[PDB]
Amino acid sequence: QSYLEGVKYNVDSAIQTITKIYNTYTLFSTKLTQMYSTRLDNFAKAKAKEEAAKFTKEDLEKNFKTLLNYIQVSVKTAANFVYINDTHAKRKLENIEAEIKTLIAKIKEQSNLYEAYKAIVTSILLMRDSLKEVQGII
Amino acid sequence: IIGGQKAKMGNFPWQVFTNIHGRGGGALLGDRWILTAAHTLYPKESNASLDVFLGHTNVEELMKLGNHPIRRVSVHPDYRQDESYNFEGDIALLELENSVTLGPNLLPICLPDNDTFYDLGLMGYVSGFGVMEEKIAHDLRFVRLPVANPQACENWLRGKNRMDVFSQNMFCAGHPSLKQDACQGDSGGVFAVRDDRWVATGIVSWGIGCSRGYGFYTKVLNYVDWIKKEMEE
Amino acid sequence: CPQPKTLDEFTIIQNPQYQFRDYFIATCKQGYQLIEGNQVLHSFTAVCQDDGTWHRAMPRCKIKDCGQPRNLPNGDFRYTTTMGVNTYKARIQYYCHEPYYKMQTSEQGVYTCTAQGIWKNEQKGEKIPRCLPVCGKPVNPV
Numbered sequence A: 001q002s003y004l005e006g007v008k009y010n011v012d013s014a015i016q017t018i019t020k021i022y023n024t025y026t027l028f029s030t031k032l033t034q035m036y037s038t039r040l041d042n043f044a045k046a047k048a049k050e051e052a053a054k055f056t057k058e059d060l061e062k063n064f065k066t067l068l069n070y071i072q073v074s075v076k077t078a079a080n081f082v083y084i085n086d087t088h089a090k091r092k093l094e095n096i097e098a099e100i101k102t103l104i105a106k107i108k109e110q111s112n113l114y115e116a117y118k119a120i121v122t123s124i125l126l127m128r129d130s131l132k133e134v135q136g137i138i
Numbered sequence B: 001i002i003g004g005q006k007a008k009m010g011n012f013p014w015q016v017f018t019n020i021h022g023r024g025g026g027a028l029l030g031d032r033w034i035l036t037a038a039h040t041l042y043p044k045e046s047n048a049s050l051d052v053f054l055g056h057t058n059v060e061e062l063m064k065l066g067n068h069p070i071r072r073v074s075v076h077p078d079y080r081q082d083e084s085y086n087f088e089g090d091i092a093l094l095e096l097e098n099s100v101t102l103g104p105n106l107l108p109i110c111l112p113d114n115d116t117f118y119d120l121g122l123m124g125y126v127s128g129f130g131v132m133e134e135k136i137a138h139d140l141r142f143v144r145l146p147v148a149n150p151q152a153c154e155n156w157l158r159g160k161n162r163m164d165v166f167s168q169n170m171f172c173a174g175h176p177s178l179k180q181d182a183c184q185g186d187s188g189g190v191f192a193v194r195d196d197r198w199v200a201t202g203i204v205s206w207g208i209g210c211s212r213g214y215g216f217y218t219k220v221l222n223y224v225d226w227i228k229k230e231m232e233e
Numbered sequence C: 001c002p003q004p005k006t007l008d009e010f011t012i013i014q015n016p017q018y019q020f021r022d023y024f025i026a027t028c029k030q031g032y033q034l035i036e037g038n039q040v041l042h043s044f045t046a047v048c049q050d051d052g053t054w055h056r057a058m059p060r061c062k063i064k065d066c067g068q069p070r071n072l073p074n075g076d077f078r079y080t081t082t083m084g085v086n087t088y089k090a091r092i093q094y095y096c097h098e099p100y101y102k103m104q105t106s107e108q109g110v111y112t113c114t115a116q117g118i119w120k121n122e123q124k125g126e127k128i129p130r131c132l133p134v135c136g137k138p139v140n141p142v
């Protein structure tokens, strides 16, 4: 229980970081939805020409040093669990650290932001859906 | 989609998603064949990636249900992305790498046969995961657009003063009174019409402005030949 | 040499007195298999010997199992005879997923175990039917 007020939190905060990434893609993706359009000739194009350009990688990349770090401290904190309903979980908090340090790698080869804001778009939706079961037992 | 009600499940099975260059939609025919606007792959304005999503109607699960790969891409030869104000043949066929099994949420759409489906006074439907009236979307959206008298659609164009092209390979749907109309992000869907056979009479080609006006839908009936022959599996 | 005998009624004897150098042929009915232990044969030839004893074992003649139906893309099947039988004159029918799929074309989806040993349709031969995707008609369009 004492290790949970330190693991439950950090996992719930990691989920907080996740939805903070997909919602950014929702707006950013839309700001490019308007850029590549047949209705907006050059009324919003000039607006998206700088608006959608607001989104950098240093922002998103830093948005990862957070998720992984937060998911790397829950795994290191909840290493005390020795029974079945927690040691089965421990690794679920570890493969995610093995699914995070794989995602960060995909960013590092992508050269366009919207190309890198997708190689994860199928990932961090299910990854967040994986941190949905660590609540029941908790 | 602007002025569009939420889409319940089963209503629009064929509807696709294209995060290729930018967000957009499509349609399903047979099982391994996606229909979408040519400009979804080739906008008029860095290398892209072809990502097709299918099955669900809420965006989240659609992204949790994997992006099917791409086997064959064929855009119609009558397409020129160089021409900044031309959209003749904004039609394209996409072959899926691996076929999808058909269920009541993954059915394919039919094609039109008579020109009749292109009369003046019939209600068709257009679906897209795109921009709503004052925000973005997370769900599928359906609208009930009547096909318009095209003579007035060149009247509307010259009334806006526009040196664009309205090739008869196109029909136009809507009315400037219509609060409901196609918007950006739905630029690949299909004007779905019902006989109970649902067919894809039109492709979301282009237009000017999102709400309150006439939209330009590349009519497919002239192209149905190119579709059957490009489905040679 | 001592004359042979027919184990079951599933063995017609070809070619009353058998001496030396003599023999007899063995073929079986119209659509059955012949086997002498566990080795699939088609033409049995028993010769005698010196001491007046047949060397080889007079084989049994069991019915030709037409195997399992070649797996059908998007579609199962129902046994129009007894469930789980693949012997002679069995008759089955593939069906496509209805109504999400439909069959390519008058019942000509009806296959049956012929005497050869493979599933043959009355028209399409061994070649099974084909299920294509049904366009339009959503389970709930409007």
Ligand SMILES: *[C@@H]1O[C@H](CO)[C@@H](O)[C@H](O)[C@H]1NC(C)=O
Binding pocket: B113, B114, B116
């Ligand atoms: C197509 O048009 C022909 C000629 O008017 C008509 O006979 C036929 O019923 C129509 N078929 C459809 C699609 O209703």
